[PDB]
Amino acid sequence: SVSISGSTSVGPVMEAEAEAFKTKKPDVSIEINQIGSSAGIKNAMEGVSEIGMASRDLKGEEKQAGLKEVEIAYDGIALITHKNNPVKDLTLVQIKDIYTGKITNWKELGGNDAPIVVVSREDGSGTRDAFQEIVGFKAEELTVNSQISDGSGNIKSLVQGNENAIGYISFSYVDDSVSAVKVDGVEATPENVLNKSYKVSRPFLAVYKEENLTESGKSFIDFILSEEGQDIVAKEHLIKV
Ligand SMILES: [Zn+2]
Ligand SMILES: [Zn+2]
Ligand SMILES: [Zn+2]
Ligand SMILES: [Zn+2]
Secondary structure, three states: EEEEEEEEHHHHHHHHHHHHHHHOOOOOOOOEEEEHHHHHHHHHOOOOOOOEEEEEOHHHHHHHHEEEEEEEEEEEEEEEEEOOOOOOOEEEHHHHHOOOOOOHHHHHOOOOOOOOOOEEEOOOOOOOOHHHHHHHOOOHHHOOOEEEEOHHHHHHHHHHOOOOEEEEEHHHHOOOOOOEEEOOEEEOOOHHHHHOOOOEEEEEEEEOOOOOOHHHHHHHHHHHHHHHHHHHHOOOOOOOO
């Protein structure tokens, strides 16, 4: 009964939210399709979904379609490497140099003599948008040798599968199978996003048209914002608020 689509970064928390909400409102069903931020935003603009989930802010034109926004969490973006890469700390400008193809071998960062396998998300990813904005490069500048992975799960799998890969992903997906680098000497933790020392972060938004949001969908968003819903955000390695 409540259709939600969009961000892959938001998918794990939204699924957790839905299952917990099922105990509060058993007669509501929440349908979640993880297709990336831009597509979920467009589905909300077009009335295809009741709620869009985004992991970037709206563009002015998306806003103009009459979309309200509700911030449900903040989220860090980790730069992940394969486990046991000797490079454990990068400055934002080093990251920019990698993603624009200026630096191409891990030795240029003090690592192994090996080519860097640069991994980017697909066009329309909210993580890609925020990452590029913060690191400080345009889509035009992304190295032509970048692999493109479609969705959070795929970027993690690529990095898991290649010793020399580097990718970016929501903290929600980071586990012991990959290594998040320090950024500018700051560990990639929800605590350091909260205290503003970890610089790569972005909101999670639920977006909707007031005309389309049902009492069930409003209920669900209110639950996510509740004390219990915000504990679920924290458990998914996000930042409350
Ligand atoms: Zn906004
Ligand atoms: Zn390995
Ligand atoms: Zn609590
Ligand atoms: Zn976990």
